[PDB]
């Protein structure tokens, strides 16, 4: 409620220029239930979008904690985090999956993953929660299930035009699924994903996605007997190198050595 | 009638009304809300959405494809400009005369297709003074600065860029404003290099590198690779020339023809 106050005063806006005066003071002073309808109305007058209001929640709290401890690469703190969330099924499964990256003994069980994938498969419309769960747990989902879920995600996710985060994420996960489809020679799956990815990249900058897609689509061309695909992959590696993206550069260069 | 949407999202995740009920909202109060028979506080709605692991910004994106008055204004101008349709842009400016900052922006954009209409420096002064008054730069302020930059003198533009860079808000789940600030910072860096304000250039280079730290944003990184290379060259670093050529190759490899041609024409001109 008082988040409204600071944002209002932050733009040097008065109550009198924004209902009545005393009415708006209430809520800012906590003397009334405001409906979200009237809240969006006030934020719109202040020229603040709701996407922006949220930026300035259980799942976000967890992510912030994971991010902090994972940046420190501190296994002990992450195991403590795992304990604190052990009673939350999907969340703890995700923590184990993430923790596995820097502690190979930690892994979600087959049954934990199965409970997660059954949930994702049951959702009618994917949001940030489902997208992030799939992304962080992908290493422990077999490919056939991963493609199934990726297909559901792409064909039934929502995103804001004012905030295309979900769209960007779905694009990245679609490309990730694509490079595996090509690894396992599911070229019918690959064909499907290429058309979805091309569509998602339309009228967007997204140079990171285009760069990885240049590599993966080139990888696809090569296995389809098109030699020029090799050029595309080499070009993608140069982009990583030129931008000083060492992790991406050395990571994809290694995939190149293996598969090419 | 946000209730209909809450219901569809709830049923969509196979969640029961009972599991959402608690100390703050009963089952009856939730179902009455979903049916549009009653209304609940925003605090209580956010509580329900938190249980569904949906944030209110996601919730508003569904339910309705409508947008804020400002974002809708931008949408019209955006493709009116693409149409080169001077008719409606002149008409759009009419309904916003009572909106000082909005009209000033429309004039600034309208200028870049028919220069007879430009914001008066009196209008620009009111805008810049407003931007200087704000304590936290949001989408509104960032976009206003962006679309009016051509009519702001460099020195004020540099001070406004400093203010923006050091007082904008962004979350880890929404990098939108941060990406925009990075772009406008680069655009100010371009002017700093051309006017040889190398003290200002050095400042902006440090900020941009920090803004790009631990982020994707390969577009901003590609442009900055070129612009920073242009800065390095003007001060006697031949490596800056290679950086610019590298940036050109990126545009080319990614099939970004327009950006490739445009920057290539700048590379041929200023060498």
DSSP class per residue in B245-267: HHHHHHHHHTT-HHHHHHHHHHH
Q: What radius of gyration, in Å, describes the C-alpha atoms of chain B?
A: 24
Distance from CA of B12 to the nearest CA of A (A): 5
Of the candidates B60, B73, B172, B144, the one whose C-alpha atom is nearest the C-alpha of residue A50 is B60
Q: Is A226 left (phi over 0), alpha (psi -120 to 50) or beta?
A: beta
- Backbone gaps in chain A, preceding residues (C–N over 2.5 A): 18, 56
Distance from CA of A213 to the nearest CA of B (A): 9
Which chain B residue is nearest to residue A236, measuring alpha carbons? B253
Among candidates B2, B140, B173 on the partner chain, residue whose Cβ is nearest the Cβ of A165: B173
Q: Cβ of A55 and B139 within 8 Å?
A: no
- For A201, other C-beta atoms within 10 Å of its C-beta total 16
Structure tokens at B212: 């790009």
Structure tokens at A100: 């596995």
Distances (CA, A) of B213 to A13, A258, B65, B201, B216: 34, 30, 34, 18, 9
Among candidates B46, B56, B61 on the partner chain, residue whose Cβ is nearest the Cβ of A159: B61
Which chain B residue is nearest to residue A60, measuring alpha carbons? B173
Q: Cβ of B221 and A214 within 8 Å?
A: no
* Residue A246 neighbours by CB under 8 Å, 6+ apart: A240
| In contact, A27 and A1? CB cutoff 8 Å | yes
Question: Determination method here?
Answer: X-ray
Q: With contacts defined as CB-CB under 8 Å, which chain B residues touch A85?
A: none
Report d(CA A139, CA A180) in Å as an integer.
11
* Residue A164 neighbours by CB under 8 Å, 6+ apart: A204, B176
Q: Cβ of B169 and A55 within 8 Å?
A: yes
| In contact, A201 and A178? CB cutoff 8 Å | no
Resolution for this experimental structure (Å): 2.1
Report d(CA B60, CA A130) in Å as an integer.
18
Q: Cβ of B53 and A129 within 8 Å?
A: yes
B154, B239, B182, B149 alpha-carbon torsion, rounded to 10°: 20
Among candidates A37, A52, A122 on the partner chain, residue whose Cβ is nearest the Cβ of B139: A52
């Amino acid at each position: 409620g008082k988040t409204l106050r600071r944002l209002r005063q932050g733009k040097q806006v008065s109550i009198s220029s924004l209902l009545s005066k005393s009415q708006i003071s209430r809520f800012e002073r906590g003397e009334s239930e405001i409906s979200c309808s009237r809240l969006l109305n006030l934020l719109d007058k202040l020229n603040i979008t709701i996407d922006e209001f949220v930026s300035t929640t259980h799942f976000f709290t967890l992510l912030s904690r994971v991010r902090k401890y994972y940046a420190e690469k501190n296994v002990a703190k992450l195991l403590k985090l795992l304990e604190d969330y052990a009673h939350k099924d999907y969340e703890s499964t995700m923590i184990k999956a993430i923790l596995s990256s820097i502690e190979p003994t930690v892994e979600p069980s087959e049954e934990e993953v199965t409970r997660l994938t059954d949930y994702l498969f049951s959702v009618e419309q994917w949001g940030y929660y489902e997208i992030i769960l799939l992304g962080n747990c992908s290493r422990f989902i077999n490919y056939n299930t991963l493609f199934l879920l990726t297909k559901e995600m792409v064909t039934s996710f929502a995103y804001s035009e004012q905030n295309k985060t979900n769209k960007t994420l779905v694009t990245q996960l679609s490309i990730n699924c694509l490079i595996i489809s090509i690894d396992y020679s599911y070229f019918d799956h690959s064909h499907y994903l290429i058309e979805k990815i091309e569509f998602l990249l339309r009228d967007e900058l997204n140079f990171y996605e285009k760069t990885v897609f240049l590599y993966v689509h080139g990888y696809y061309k090569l296995k389809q007997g098109q030699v020029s695909g090799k050029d595309d992959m080499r070009q993608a590696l140069q982009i990583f190198k030129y931008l000083g993206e060492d992790a991406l550069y050395y990571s994809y260069k290694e995939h190149y050595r293996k598969e090419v």
